[PDB]
Amino acid sequence: GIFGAIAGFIEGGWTGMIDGWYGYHHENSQGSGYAADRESTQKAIDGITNKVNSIINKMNTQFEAVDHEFSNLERRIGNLNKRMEDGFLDVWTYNAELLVLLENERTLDLHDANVKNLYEKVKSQLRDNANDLGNGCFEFWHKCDNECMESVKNGTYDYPKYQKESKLNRQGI
């Protein structure tokens, strides 16, 4: 994908993460499960919704075709009407079709960017207190219980707090 995360360095999606577009999956002694990152998901929803409503808005005028009859001495203006109406029909078909293809590419990139950013956000809190497995997963060099998991998700993870423990484990292995 262009930011390289979705179907990228993160191979597949989660059917188990049912309450959001982007999320965390966690495992610890306490348990395992899925949680959406609410803030990034709600911002994407607002953005996508604005995009859809903008497009609907801008597309909210209509060319008017008409039922007028023409006589056998009105071939030129009859054809003028015909090429005129077809003319606008072709321009609007083009605009709608090209717009959907283009916006569909950019909408997928946006999602790919939000996943990538969510991953970079976690990565930089954790520093070397965790080990990169591949596939967007980090293995902690220390015990990370539920409160510690939440602080990663919240953006308040305490790297100094677990540094000494992480360093001792990183050595013995």
Partner: protein, 330 residues
């Protein structure tokens, strides 16, 4: 062995696909179809107003008052007009309705007409009214009749056909739509029989309009058993204008005419055989009612009311969710 946290994205059982500039047939978790392709194959009421069904009569047959179109005779109010493709009852006495396309356009404009007697038969002096009838214009009851809105005037038993005059002064607030004609015999014989001898004319005028026509006599190919023709004409007498009719002979005279209410609505004439039913619509196309929220439609370019924009597309699906990559179950 150790505690994991992983960053990922949603997937689901969606099989719906979109296209993008770079890739076709991309399955996505969420999307919206912006294009409507469904319709109800029927005509409904627009703004709670029923369309006019012309049934077995064409627009000509209707407003001239073809004798077989009595079902439509009188007042009519409509949101749009529906004319069946194989209506039989139009111009029954052969001839041209001049400026027909522009008449059809003007009638499409209206939301309502009121029929009324414009020139009483008594208006014309020294001529015979009650013989203005033909076999090419039967009603359903009588074999020889004539349009309900025109008098075919004939000279009385005296060889002379006198100059006749008629005036109507539109003291109303509505324009009046009215019709007349000029008869063209296949014969100088028939010409003599029905009208006087010598040069005949039909002249008419208003404060802003002139008309002068004389007969053009010749045998034409038979139609409805007639080798003669009638030139039909239409016009619109503005509020405050006066009409003067003057004729030597060959006048088919205005008898009834219509007060005409122009419409705020765009107006339409649909040529179609679809049913009219007791239903309501917001969007009426010529091939059906669209009952929809969508932005685009592929049903028809021709419509009255509030419709989505017409495009040739088969589908316009916008991705809203992301690329759907669910785990393989096995």
């Amino acid at each position: 062995p150790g505690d994991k946290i992983c960053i990922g994205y949603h997937a689901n059982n969606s099989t719906t696909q979109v296209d993008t500039l770079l890739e076709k047939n991309v399955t996505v978790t969420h999307s919206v179809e912006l294009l409507e392709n469904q319709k109800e194959k029927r005509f409904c009421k627009i703004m709670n107003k029923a369309p006019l069904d012309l049934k077995d009569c064409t627009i000509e047959g209707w407003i001239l008052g073809n004798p077989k179109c009595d079902l439509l005779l009188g007042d009519q109010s409509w949101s749009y007009i529906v004319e069946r493709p194989n209506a039989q009852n139009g111009i029954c006495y052969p001839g041209v309705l001049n400026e027909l396309e522009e008449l059809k356009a003007f009638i499409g404009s209206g939301e309502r007409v009121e029929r009324f007697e414009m020139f009483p038969k008594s208006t014309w002096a020294g001529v015979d009214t009650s013989r203005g009838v033909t076999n090419a214009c039967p009603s359903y009851t009588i074999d020889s009749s004539f349009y309900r809105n025109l008098v075919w005037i004939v000279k009385t038993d005296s060889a002379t056909y006198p100059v006749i005059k008629g005036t109507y002064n539109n003291t109303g607030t509505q324009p009046i739509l009215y019709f007349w004609g000029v008869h063209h015999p296949l014969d100088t014989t028939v010409q003599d029989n029905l009208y006087g001898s010598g040069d005949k004319y039909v002249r008419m005028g208003t404060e802003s309009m002139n008309f002068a026509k004389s007969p053009e006599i010749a045998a034409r190919p038979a139609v409805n058993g007639q080798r003669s023709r009638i030139d039909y004409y239409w016009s619109v007498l503005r509020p405050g204008e006066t009409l003067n009719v003057e004729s030597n002979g060959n006048l088919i005279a205005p008898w009834y005419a219509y007060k005409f209410v122009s419409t705020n609505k765009k107006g339409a004439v649909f040529k179609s055989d679809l049913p009219i039913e007791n239903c309501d619509a917001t969007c009426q196309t010529i091939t059906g009612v669209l009952r929809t929220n969508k932005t685009f439609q592929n049903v028809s370019p021709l419509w009255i009311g509030e419709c989505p924009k017409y495009v040739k597309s088969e589908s316009l699906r916008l991705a809203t969710g992301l690329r759907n990559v669910p785990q393989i179950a096995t």
